[PDB]
C-alpha cells in the first residue's frame, strides 16, 4: 500500500562517506565535523596522494535528484495538522515528517489526516 511518488528516477551520488576532519582519529577533542585545514605544512590541503579528501564543489548532487530521499520523495517538517493542507497539492513529490516534539495525542490526529489526504509520512508509527 506504499504511496508511490510521481516519478522515481535513478539516484546517483558522487560520494557516500562523510568528510572527516584532519586527524579526527588520533584525538578525541577533534570531532568528525569538517574544518578546512589551513596550516602551512599540512599534507591534506596540498592534496597529497592517499591522504584525506576535501569537500570540493565537484561532489555536488544532481539537481534533478537533490534532497530526494530514497523513496523518491522530498521532505517537509510538519508541526501540526494545519501544515498538511499546505502539502496536499504537492502530494506525489513531497512527504511529511511530524516534528520530534508533537506529542502522540496530536501525532495520531496528524497521521490520521495525512492518511485521508493520502500524504505519505516517513515516521507514521513514531510514538504510539
Amino acid at each position: 500500500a506504499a504511496l508511490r511518488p510521481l516519478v522515481k528516477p535513478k539516484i546517483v551520488k558522487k560520494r557516500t562517506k562523510k568528510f572527516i576532519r584532519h586527524q579526527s582519529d588520533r584525538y578525541v577533542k577533534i570531532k568528525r565535523n569538517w574544518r578546512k585545514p589551513r596550516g602551512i605544512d599540512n599534507r591534506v590541503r596540498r592534496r597529497f596522494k592517499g591522504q584525506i579528501l576535501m569537500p570540493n564543489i565537484g561532489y555536488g548532487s544532481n539537481k534533478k535528484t537533490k534532497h530526494m530521499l530514497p523513496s523518491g520523495f522530498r521532505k517537509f517538517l510538519v508541526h501540526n495538522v494545519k501544515e498538511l493542507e499546505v502539502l496536499l497539492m504537492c502530494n506525489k513529490s513531497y512527504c511529511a515528517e511530524i516534528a520530534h516534539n508533537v506529542s502522540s495525542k496530536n501525532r495520531k490526529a496528524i497521521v490520521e489526516r495525512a492518511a485521508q489526504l493520502a500524504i505519505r509520512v516517513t515516521n507514521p508509527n513514531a510514538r504510539l
Binding site: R35, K36, R38, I40
Partner: protein, 147 residues
C-alpha cells in the same frame, strides 16, 4: 552590526587578515604623525605639501566678528525679494524701482557674477564691488550705501 562586519569571516584563519610574515605588531612606525621629516617624508610631501614651516604675520587677539562680511552674488540677488516684486516691476510702467535691501537679508558685500534681468533696482548694501556696480549701471539702477 557585527554580523555584517569583516571579523565574522576571519574566524579560523591564523593571521586574522593581517599577514603571516609581517605580523600585526603594535606601532611599527611610531605613534601619530611621527617621522614627518625622516621616514614619512615621501608621504608628507606627496600628500601634505607645505605642512612644515612658518609663513606670514601672527595676529594675537583675533576676533572673528570684526571681519564679518557674508557676500551675495548678482545671480541670486533677485531671490532676496518676493516674486510679486520682480514681476510687479516687470508689469510696472511708471519706472519705479524696487529697493532690494541686502543687509536686511544678511549679506554685507555684493559681488557681481551672474547676469541680471533688464529692470531697474535700488540695491542697498554695505560694500559694493566695481563689477557688481557696473552690471547695475549697465542695466539702470542705483547702488545705495548703508553704514
Amino acid at each position: 552590526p557585527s554580523r555584517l562586519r569583516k571579523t565574522r569571516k576571519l574566524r579560523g584563519h591564523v593571521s586574522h587578515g593581517h599577514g603571516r610574515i609581517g605580523k600585526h605588531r603594535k606601532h611599527p612606525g611610531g605613534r601619530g604623525n611621527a617621522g614627518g621629516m625622516h621616514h614619512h617624508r615621501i608621504n608628507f610631501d606627496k600628500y601634505h605639501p607645505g605642512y612644515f614651516g612658518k609663513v606670514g604675520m601672527r595676529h594675537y587677539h583675533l576676533k572673528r566678528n570684526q571681519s564679518f562680511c557674508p557676500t551675495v552674488n548678482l545671480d541670486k540677488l533677485w531671490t532676496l525679494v518676493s516674486e510679486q516684486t520682480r514681476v510687479n516691476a516687470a508689469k510696472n510702467k511708471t519706472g519705479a524701482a524696487p529697493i532690494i535691501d541686502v543687509v536686511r537679508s544678511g549679506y554685507y558685500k555684493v559681488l557681481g557674477k551672474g547676469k541680471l534681468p533688464k529692470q531697474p533696482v535700488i540695491v542697498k548694501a554695505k560694500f559694493f564691488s566695481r563689477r557688481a556696480e557696473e552690471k547695475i549701471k549697465g542695466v539702470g539702477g542705483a547702488c545705495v550705501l548703508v553704514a
